[PDB]
Short mmCIF file of C-alpha atoms and ligand atoms in Angstrom, two decimals:
data_model
loop_
_atom_site.label_atom_id
_atom_site.label_comp_id
_atom_site.label_asym_id
_atom_site.label_seq_id
_atom_site.Cartn_x
_atom_site.Cartn_y
_atom_site.Cartn_z
CA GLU J 89 -0.14 -0.05 -0.12
CA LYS J 90 2.20 3.07 -1.41
CA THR J 91 0.36 6.42 -1.70
CA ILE J 92 0.88 9.43 -3.88
CA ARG J 93 -1.25 12.72 -3.27
CA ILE J 94 -1.84 15.00 -5.83
CA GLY J 95 -3.04 18.71 -5.66
CA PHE J 96 -4.90 20.36 -8.48
CA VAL J 97 -6.57 23.71 -9.26
CA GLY J 98 -10.30 22.30 -9.60
CA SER J 99 -10.79 23.88 -13.01
CA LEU J 100 -8.13 21.70 -14.49
CA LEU J 101 -10.52 19.12 -14.47
CA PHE J 102 -12.19 20.55 -17.70
CA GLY J 103 -9.15 19.76 -19.54
CA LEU J 104 -6.52 16.90 -19.77
CA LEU J 105 -6.04 16.13 -16.12
CA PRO J 106 -8.58 13.45 -15.62
CA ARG J 107 -7.49 11.61 -18.56
CA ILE J 108 -3.97 11.92 -17.17
CA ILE J 109 -4.95 10.34 -13.77
CA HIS J 110 -6.83 7.81 -15.39
CA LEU J 111 -3.97 6.50 -17.36
CA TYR J 112 -1.78 6.87 -14.38
CA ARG J 113 -4.13 4.67 -12.06
CA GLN J 114 -4.07 1.89 -14.84
CA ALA J 115 -0.24 1.80 -15.12
CA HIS J 116 -0.09 1.50 -11.06
CA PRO J 117 -2.91 -0.80 -10.12
CA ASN J 118 -1.02 -0.99 -6.59
CA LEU J 119 -0.82 3.02 -6.13
CA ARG J 120 -2.97 4.59 -3.84
CA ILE J 121 -3.87 7.95 -5.75
CA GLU J 122 -5.10 10.96 -3.36
CA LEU J 123 -6.62 13.80 -5.06
CA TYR J 124 -6.81 17.12 -3.43
CA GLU J 125 -8.32 20.35 -4.98
CA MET J 126 -6.33 23.51 -4.06
CA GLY J 127 -5.45 26.76 -5.70
CA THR J 128 -1.86 27.12 -7.05
CA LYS J 129 -0.72 29.41 -4.00
CA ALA J 130 -1.91 26.64 -1.67
CA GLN J 131 0.01 24.13 -3.39
CA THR J 132 3.56 25.67 -1.92
CA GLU J 133 2.93 25.06 1.88
CA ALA J 134 1.05 21.54 0.67
CA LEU J 135 4.40 20.57 -0.82
CA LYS J 136 6.79 21.63 1.77
CA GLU J 137 4.79 20.00 4.55
CA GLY J 138 4.36 16.74 2.63
CA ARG J 139 0.53 17.11 2.27
CA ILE J 140 0.82 16.78 -1.73
CA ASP J 141 3.75 15.31 -3.74
CA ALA J 142 2.93 17.02 -7.15
CA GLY J 143 0.79 19.96 -7.67
CA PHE J 144 -0.95 20.81 -11.18
CA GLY J 145 -1.36 24.82 -11.13
CA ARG J 146 -1.99 27.80 -13.19
CA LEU J 147 1.05 30.02 -12.77
CA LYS J 148 4.70 29.65 -11.13
CA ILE J 149 4.96 30.90 -7.68
CA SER J 150 8.55 31.08 -6.37
CA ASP J 151 9.77 29.44 -3.40
CA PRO J 152 13.25 28.06 -2.86
CA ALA J 153 11.84 24.80 -1.31
CA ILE J 154 9.49 23.98 -4.68
CA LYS J 155 10.55 23.52 -7.94
CA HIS J 156 8.41 23.93 -11.29
CA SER J 157 8.36 22.37 -14.94
CA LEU J 158 5.95 24.37 -17.47
CA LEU J 159 3.60 21.55 -18.85
CA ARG J 160 2.23 23.59 -21.41
CA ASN J 161 0.45 26.88 -22.32
CA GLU J 162 -3.53 26.86 -23.04
CA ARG J 163 -4.79 29.23 -25.46
CA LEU J 164 -7.28 32.19 -23.84
CA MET J 165 -10.50 32.54 -25.09
CA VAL J 166 -13.50 35.53 -24.54
CA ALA J 167 -16.55 34.20 -23.34
CA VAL J 168 -19.44 35.98 -24.74
CA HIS J 169 -22.86 36.06 -24.87
CA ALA J 170 -24.13 35.20 -28.04
CA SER J 171 -25.70 38.08 -28.95
CA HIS J 172 -22.71 40.50 -28.09
CA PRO J 173 -20.79 41.93 -30.97
CA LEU J 174 -17.55 40.13 -30.31
CA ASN J 175 -19.59 36.86 -31.15
CA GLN J 176 -19.39 38.06 -34.93
CA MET J 177 -15.71 37.48 -34.40
CA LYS J 178 -16.12 33.79 -33.64
CA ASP J 179 -14.57 31.91 -36.50
CA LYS J 180 -11.52 34.72 -36.58
CA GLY J 181 -10.88 35.77 -33.29
CA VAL J 182 -10.13 39.21 -31.49
CA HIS J 183 -7.50 40.86 -29.68
CA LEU J 184 -7.05 42.36 -26.05
CA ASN J 185 -7.62 45.73 -27.02
CA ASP J 186 -11.28 45.07 -28.27
CA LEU J 187 -12.07 44.44 -24.53
CA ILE J 188 -11.12 47.37 -22.56
CA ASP J 189 -14.58 48.99 -22.66
CA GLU J 190 -16.32 45.62 -21.62
CA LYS J 191 -17.55 44.44 -18.05
CA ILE J 192 -14.99 41.39 -17.48
CA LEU J 193 -15.31 38.99 -15.33
CA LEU J 194 -12.25 37.80 -13.42
CA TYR J 195 -11.50 34.78 -11.09
CA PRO J 196 -11.07 32.95 -8.77
CA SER J 197 -11.53 34.94 -5.46
CA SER J 198 -8.98 32.87 -3.51
CA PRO J 199 -5.67 34.61 -2.49
CA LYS J 200 -3.41 36.51 -4.94
CA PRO J 201 -1.44 35.70 -7.38
CA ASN J 202 -3.82 33.60 -8.96
CA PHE J 203 -5.36 32.83 -12.44
CA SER J 204 -6.50 36.69 -12.75
CA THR J 205 -2.94 38.26 -11.83
CA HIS J 206 -1.80 36.90 -15.31
CA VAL J 207 -4.83 38.10 -17.11
CA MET J 208 -4.49 41.63 -15.83
CA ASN J 209 -0.83 41.54 -16.67
CA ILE J 210 -1.27 40.74 -20.30
CA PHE J 211 -3.49 43.84 -20.60
CA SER J 212 -0.90 46.04 -18.49
CA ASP J 213 1.84 44.72 -20.99
CA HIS J 214 0.64 46.52 -24.02
CA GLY J 215 -0.53 49.60 -22.09
CA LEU J 216 -4.23 48.60 -21.80
CA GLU J 217 -6.36 49.32 -18.87
CA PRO J 218 -9.68 47.65 -18.48
CA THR J 219 -12.16 49.83 -16.99
CA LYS J 220 -14.80 47.51 -15.74
CA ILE J 221 -13.79 44.23 -13.39
CA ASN J 222 -15.35 42.10 -11.55
CA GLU J 223 -14.06 39.06 -9.27
CA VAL J 224 -16.04 36.08 -8.96
CA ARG J 225 -15.52 32.70 -7.23
CA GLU J 226 -14.40 30.59 -10.25
CA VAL J 227 -14.27 30.04 -13.69
CA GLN J 228 -17.75 28.02 -14.12
CA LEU J 229 -19.71 30.45 -12.33
CA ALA J 230 -18.06 33.50 -14.74
CA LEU J 231 -19.12 31.44 -17.78
CA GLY J 232 -23.06 30.96 -16.38
CA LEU J 233 -22.90 34.86 -15.40
CA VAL J 234 -21.53 35.59 -19.02
CA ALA J 235 -24.65 33.43 -20.39
CA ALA J 236 -27.15 35.37 -18.09
CA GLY J 237 -25.69 38.96 -19.65
CA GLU J 238 -23.46 39.92 -16.55
CA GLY J 239 -20.41 40.85 -19.17
CA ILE J 240 -17.59 38.95 -20.77
CA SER J 241 -14.87 36.46 -19.44
CA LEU J 242 -11.28 35.69 -20.65
CA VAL J 243 -11.13 31.90 -20.02
CA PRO J 244 -8.58 28.79 -20.71
CA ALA J 245 -9.67 27.22 -24.32
CA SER J 246 -10.34 23.80 -21.84
CA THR J 247 -13.43 25.39 -20.44
CA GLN J 248 -15.29 24.31 -23.81
CA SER J 249 -15.95 21.29 -22.04
CA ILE J 250 -18.83 23.73 -20.61
CA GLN J 251 -21.09 24.43 -23.38
CA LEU J 252 -24.34 26.67 -22.28
CA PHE J 253 -27.19 27.96 -24.33
CA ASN J 254 -26.23 31.24 -25.90
CA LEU J 255 -22.53 31.16 -24.46
CA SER J 256 -19.76 31.22 -27.32
CA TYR J 257 -16.29 31.06 -27.00
CA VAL J 258 -14.13 33.73 -28.96
CA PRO J 259 -10.48 32.95 -29.89
CA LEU J 260 -7.89 35.90 -28.52
CA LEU J 261 -5.25 36.27 -31.06
CA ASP J 262 -2.34 38.34 -29.08
CA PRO J 263 0.37 35.52 -29.06
CA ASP J 264 0.57 36.02 -25.04
CA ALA J 265 -3.07 35.54 -24.29
CA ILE J 266 -2.36 32.26 -23.20
CA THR J 267 -2.30 30.75 -19.54
CA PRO J 268 0.46 28.31 -18.27
CA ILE J 269 -0.28 24.89 -16.80
CA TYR J 270 2.73 23.96 -14.38
CA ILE J 271 3.58 20.69 -12.35
CA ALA J 272 5.16 21.71 -8.84
CA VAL J 273 7.01 19.45 -6.38
CA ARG J 274 9.52 19.67 -3.66
CA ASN J 275 13.00 20.99 -4.66
CA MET J 276 14.70 17.59 -4.67
CA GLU J 277 14.78 14.53 -6.64
CA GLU J 278 11.47 13.24 -7.91
CA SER J 279 10.78 9.86 -6.76
CA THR J 280 9.78 6.92 -9.19
CA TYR J 281 6.22 7.70 -8.75
CA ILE J 282 6.63 11.62 -9.47
CA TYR J 283 8.88 10.53 -12.62
CA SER J 284 6.21 8.04 -13.39
CA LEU J 285 3.61 10.83 -13.58
CA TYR J 286 5.55 12.90 -15.62
CA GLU J 287 5.61 9.94 -18.42
CA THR J 288 1.93 9.63 -17.91
CA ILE J 289 1.85 13.36 -18.91
CA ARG J 290 4.00 13.09 -21.93
CA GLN J 291 2.44 10.23 -23.04
CA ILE J 292 -1.38 11.88 -23.09
CA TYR J 293 0.29 15.34 -24.50
CA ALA J 294 1.56 13.02 -27.26
CA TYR J 295 -1.91 11.64 -28.29
CA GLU J 296 -3.05 15.24 -28.25
CA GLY J 297 -0.60 15.92 -30.94
CA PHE J 298 1.46 18.22 -28.76
CA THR J 299 5.20 18.82 -29.24
CA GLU J 300 8.26 19.60 -27.24
CA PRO J 301 7.74 17.03 -25.79
CA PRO J 302 7.13 18.44 -22.94
CA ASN J 303 10.11 19.18 -22.49
CA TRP J 304 11.31 17.02 -20.39
CA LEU J 305 14.37 16.99 -18.24
CA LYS Y 90 -35.16 49.22 -9.50
CA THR Y 91 -32.80 46.77 -8.18
CA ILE Y 92 -33.91 43.10 -7.86
CA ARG Y 93 -31.76 40.79 -5.84
CA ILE Y 94 -31.76 36.94 -7.01
CA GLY Y 95 -30.00 34.35 -5.09
CA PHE Y 96 -29.11 31.06 -7.09
CA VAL Y 97 -27.64 27.54 -6.62
CA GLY Y 98 -24.28 27.80 -8.64
CA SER Y 99 -25.05 24.53 -10.75
CA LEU Y 100 -28.48 25.85 -11.98
CA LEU Y 101 -26.42 27.99 -14.36
CA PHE Y 102 -25.96 24.78 -16.35
CA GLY Y 103 -29.64 24.87 -17.18
CA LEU Y 104 -32.64 27.09 -18.21
CA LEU Y 105 -31.65 29.90 -15.78
CA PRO Y 106 -29.02 31.87 -17.47
CA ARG Y 107 -31.61 32.15 -20.61
CA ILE Y 108 -34.38 33.39 -17.91
CA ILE Y 109 -32.21 36.06 -16.45
CA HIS Y 110 -31.22 37.04 -19.87
CA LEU Y 111 -34.70 37.73 -21.37
CA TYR Y 112 -35.99 39.15 -18.13
CA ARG Y 113 -32.83 41.46 -18.15
CA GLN Y 114 -33.66 42.73 -21.87
CA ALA Y 115 -37.11 43.47 -21.13
CA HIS Y 116 -35.97 45.53 -17.77
CA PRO Y 117 -33.46 48.37 -19.08
CA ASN Y 118 -34.02 50.32 -16.30
CA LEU Y 119 -33.58 47.51 -13.81
CA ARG Y 120 -30.33 46.71 -11.86
CA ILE Y 121 -29.89 42.99 -11.76
CA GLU Y 122 -27.84 41.62 -8.54
CA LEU Y 123 -26.90 37.91 -8.74
CA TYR Y 124 -25.85 36.13 -5.51
CA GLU Y 125 -24.19 32.61 -5.68
CA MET Y 126 -25.75 30.67 -2.36
CA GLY Y 127 -27.16 27.24 -1.31
CA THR Y 128 -30.85 26.88 -1.11
CA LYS Y 129 -30.40 26.67 2.82
CA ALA Y 130 -28.64 30.39 2.76
CA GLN Y 131 -31.49 31.63 0.39
CA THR Y 132 -34.13 31.06 2.91
CA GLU Y 133 -32.50 33.28 5.81
CA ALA Y 134 -31.74 35.56 2.83
CA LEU Y 135 -35.14 36.19 1.66
CA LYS Y 136 -36.58 36.50 5.32
CA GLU Y 137 -33.65 39.13 6.01
CA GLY Y 138 -34.24 40.97 2.60
CA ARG Y 139 -30.80 40.13 1.12
CA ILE Y 140 -32.26 38.94 -1.67
CA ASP Y 141 -35.64 39.04 -3.34
CA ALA Y 142 -35.95 35.55 -5.12
CA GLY Y 143 -34.01 32.67 -4.93
CA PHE Y 144 -33.65 29.49 -7.23
CA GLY Y 145 -32.90 26.34 -5.36
CA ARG Y 146 -32.90 22.63 -5.43
CA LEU Y 147 -35.16 21.67 -2.45
CA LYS Y 148 -37.92 23.28 -0.26
CA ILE Y 149 -37.62 24.59 3.35
CA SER Y 150 -40.73 25.11 4.86
CA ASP Y 151 -40.84 28.36 6.48
CA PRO Y 152 -44.03 30.78 7.30
CA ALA Y 153 -42.27 33.50 5.86
CA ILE Y 154 -41.57 32.18 2.50
CA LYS Y 155 -43.65 30.63 -0.28
CA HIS Y 156 -42.55 28.33 -2.95
CA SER Y 157 -43.23 27.56 -6.38
CA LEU Y 158 -41.90 24.17 -8.03
CA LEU Y 159 -40.88 25.06 -11.47
CA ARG Y 160 -40.21 21.65 -12.68
CA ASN Y 161 -38.35 18.30 -11.81
CA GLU Y 162 -35.29 17.57 -13.49
CA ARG Y 163 -34.41 14.10 -14.21
CA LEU Y 164 -31.58 12.27 -12.44
CA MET Y 165 -28.35 10.69 -14.29
CA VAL Y 166 -25.67 8.58 -13.44
CA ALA Y 167 -22.60 10.22 -14.69
CA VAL Y 168 -19.85 7.47 -15.43
CA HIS Y 169 -16.36 6.77 -17.25
CA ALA Y 170 -17.29 5.22 -20.51
CA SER Y 171 -15.81 1.79 -20.21
CA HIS Y 172 -18.11 1.44 -16.86
CA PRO Y 173 -20.75 -1.54 -17.03
CA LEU Y 174 -23.38 0.60 -16.15
CA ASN Y 175 -22.52 2.87 -19.32
CA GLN Y 176 -23.74 -0.33 -21.29
CA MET Y 177 -27.24 0.70 -20.23
CA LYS Y 178 -27.35 3.76 -21.35
CA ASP Y 179 -30.20 3.27 -24.11
CA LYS Y 180 -32.52 1.61 -21.62
CA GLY Y 181 -31.28 3.04 -18.34
CA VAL Y 182 -30.69 1.71 -14.86
CA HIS Y 183 -32.13 1.98 -11.57
CA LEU Y 184 -31.11 3.21 -8.15
CA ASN Y 185 -30.50 -0.22 -6.83
CA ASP Y 186 -27.82 -1.00 -9.58
CA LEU Y 187 -25.73 1.47 -8.27
CA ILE Y 188 -25.36 0.15 -4.41
CA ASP Y 189 -21.92 -1.53 -4.73
CA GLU Y 190 -20.54 1.76 -6.76
CA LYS Y 191 -18.05 4.30 -5.08
CA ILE Y 192 -20.65 7.07 -5.12
CA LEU Y 193 -19.61 10.87 -5.32
CA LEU Y 194 -22.03 13.11 -3.39
CA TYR Y 195 -21.61 16.86 -3.79
CA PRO Y 196 -21.73 19.63 -2.52
CA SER Y 197 -20.03 20.09 1.00
CA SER Y 198 -22.10 23.32 1.62
CA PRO Y 199 -24.51 23.28 4.71
CA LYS Y 200 -26.86 20.63 4.82
CA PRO Y 201 -29.70 20.13 3.61
CA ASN Y 202 -28.42 20.55 0.03
CA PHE Y 203 -28.50 18.16 -3.08
CA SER Y 204 -26.59 15.15 -1.67
CA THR Y 205 -29.29 15.12 1.24
CA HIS Y 206 -31.94 14.41 -1.31
CA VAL Y 207 -29.69 12.22 -3.38
CA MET Y 208 -29.33 9.91 -0.13
CA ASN Y 209 -32.87 10.14 0.80
CA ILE Y 210 -33.98 8.44 -2.69
CA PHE Y 211 -31.44 5.77 -1.77
CA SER Y 212 -33.13 5.53 1.86
CA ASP Y 213 -36.72 6.05 0.92
CA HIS Y 214 -36.36 2.51 -1.02
CA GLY Y 215 -34.53 0.62 1.46
CA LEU Y 216 -31.00 1.19 -0.53
CA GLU Y 217 -27.63 1.86 1.22
CA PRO Y 218 -24.86 3.23 -0.90
CA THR Y 219 -22.00 1.09 0.75
CA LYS Y 220 -19.06 3.27 -0.46
CA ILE Y 221 -19.80 7.20 -0.58
CA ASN Y 222 -17.43 10.25 -0.71
CA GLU Y 223 -18.51 13.83 -0.33
CA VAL Y 224 -16.75 16.39 -2.74
CA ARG Y 225 -16.86 20.21 -2.90
CA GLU Y 226 -19.26 20.70 -6.15
CA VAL Y 227 -20.48 18.94 -9.47
CA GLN Y 228 -17.70 19.78 -11.26
CA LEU Y 229 -15.23 17.89 -8.94
CA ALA Y 230 -17.33 14.83 -9.06
CA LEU Y 231 -17.45 14.62 -12.48
CA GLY Y 232 -13.66 15.32 -13.16
CA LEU Y 233 -13.02 12.68 -10.45
CA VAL Y 234 -15.62 10.43 -12.55
CA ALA Y 235 -13.76 11.05 -15.73
CA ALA Y 236 -10.21 10.07 -13.80
CA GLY Y 237 -11.82 6.87 -12.49
CA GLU Y 238 -12.62 7.30 -9.30
CA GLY Y 239 -16.20 6.34 -9.18
CA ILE Y 240 -19.78 7.51 -10.26
CA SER Y 241 -22.04 10.42 -9.47
CA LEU Y 242 -25.57 11.33 -9.29
CA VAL Y 243 -26.22 14.33 -11.30
CA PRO Y 244 -29.34 16.61 -12.53
CA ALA Y 245 -29.88 16.26 -16.39
CA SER Y 246 -28.74 19.90 -17.09
CA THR Y 247 -25.30 18.69 -15.94
CA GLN Y 248 -24.69 17.57 -19.58
CA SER Y 249 -23.83 20.61 -20.42
CA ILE Y 250 -20.46 19.84 -19.40
CA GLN Y 251 -18.94 17.09 -21.47
CA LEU Y 252 -15.68 15.46 -20.49
CA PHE Y 253 -13.43 13.13 -22.42
CA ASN Y 254 -14.69 9.71 -21.41
CA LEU Y 255 -17.33 10.92 -19.12
CA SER Y 256 -20.98 9.54 -20.04
CA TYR Y 257 -24.37 10.05 -18.45
CA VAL Y 258 -26.77 7.83 -18.07
CA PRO Y 259 -30.34 7.68 -17.24
CA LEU Y 260 -32.24 6.68 -14.12
CA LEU Y 261 -35.35 5.00 -14.53
CA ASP Y 262 -37.13 5.46 -10.75
CA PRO Y 263 -39.93 7.98 -11.30
CA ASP Y 264 -38.44 9.51 -8.19
CA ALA Y 265 -34.99 9.82 -9.31
CA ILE Y 266 -35.50 13.38 -10.06
CA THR Y 267 -34.54 16.59 -8.53
CA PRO Y 268 -36.92 19.94 -7.96
CA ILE Y 269 -36.17 23.49 -9.19
CA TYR Y 270 -38.04 25.81 -6.97
CA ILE Y 271 -38.42 29.59 -6.89
CA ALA Y 272 -38.80 30.92 -3.41
CA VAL Y 273 -39.96 34.75 -2.66
CA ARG Y 274 -41.19 36.12 0.79
CA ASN Y 275 -44.81 35.27 1.48
CA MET Y 276 -46.16 38.95 1.02
CA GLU Y 277 -44.31 39.79 -2.18
CA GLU Y 278 -46.33 41.69 -4.99
CA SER Y 279 -43.50 43.57 -6.76
CA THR Y 280 -44.44 43.56 -10.71
CA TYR Y 281 -40.59 42.76 -11.29
CA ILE Y 282 -41.10 39.24 -9.78
CA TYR Y 283 -44.39 39.07 -11.67
CA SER Y 284 -42.59 39.66 -14.37
CA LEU Y 285 -39.84 37.26 -13.38
CA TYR Y 286 -42.50 34.59 -13.08
CA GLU Y 287 -43.76 35.33 -16.80
CA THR Y 288 -40.36 35.24 -17.75
CA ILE Y 289 -39.91 31.59 -16.63
CA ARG Y 290 -43.06 31.10 -18.07
CA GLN Y 291 -42.01 32.15 -21.61
CA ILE Y 292 -38.93 30.16 -21.74
CA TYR Y 293 -40.90 27.05 -20.28
CA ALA Y 294 -43.35 27.14 -22.99
CA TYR Y 295 -40.50 27.69 -25.86
CA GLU Y 296 -38.94 24.35 -24.45
CA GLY Y 297 -42.10 22.45 -24.17
CA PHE Y 298 -42.16 22.08 -20.52
CA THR Y 299 -45.37 22.07 -18.42
CA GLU Y 300 -46.39 25.87 -17.50
CA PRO Y 301 -45.68 26.47 -13.67
CA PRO Y 302 -48.29 27.20 -11.39
CA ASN Y 303 -49.02 30.19 -8.93
CA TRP Y 304 -48.09 32.98 -8.83
CL1 LIG E 1 -11.40 28.87 -11.62
#
């Protein structure tokens, strides 16, 4: 009875993480896999304290006691109501500077830095100042509120797992309108079980046709 | 000209957003404030005047509050594509087929909540799930199911979320359903609330659903 504990940001369950876990489980039938939802920031102390062994997060927070590998970047999209003018560009995409005067829903509401830190930074990076920002608890809430007419939201491509009536996802074309997925571990040599997790990630990414790959070590 | 609406978050996967949007369009001078909260919290929020209408998954009887059952949603079983239960997707399964499986209950908010009704419908027929685990919200349950951890009972509107190798299987028990309520203060007579009711009626009519009662 050996155990690996994995922390993850909840919204990563809309992407490739469940496939990664499922394959990892098939490869390690004797392994107990414990899954703990937590924000990226929370994963730092969880790793240092040994409450988790690896953390899937959406940014890199530097702490000397942990280390990181960039798995991949997801494209950001603009979630809009179907009646919004922006939806006419659904098949071609828009840019950050098209969004400045819109009501933007940011998320999550957990301690900073979090997903939304980078979102605001990419605006600032090009001298853009969004004039109307609201923070909500998590992405699926933001999406439901967009469908209800509450504004727009910048969301990872993976959230297209959620399809709602009159909700549309519009591509964001700025090359830096992307959001990273990181794996974080203690700053020491990975265990055999963590190395196996890396290989499982590599395998799922190979199925998706991603190239790096990814990268790794 | 401000209306405050409380809602259970998972209701945003069904008809509620299109109801709110149609309602909003018809009231350009109305400020709509939307508050995510469990059904238990809506009851106190209504009595305390913090919201004007609450959309919930259950009825908490209180003399200060009046409820209207909008409709019942079918419950479905979320399973991994490879799960034996997914071989009965066309015909459906019954609650008594689920009893030996690891069932993911949710949410972890204060009780009573959606998981209360789910466990009650088993209890109502002398069925006791042998393996249960409570998770925070529906998307955690769904992701864990897709990851191979267990199964979950969910409202049919959950099918708005489609994950790789996640399948939804109909339940056949007539009472394997989950209600959607609107709750308002007992002496509520606001024109904006009347309009909200009528907007629900319009959307339901378009969907071919039964027309909700009083009002
Ligand atoms: Cl989120």
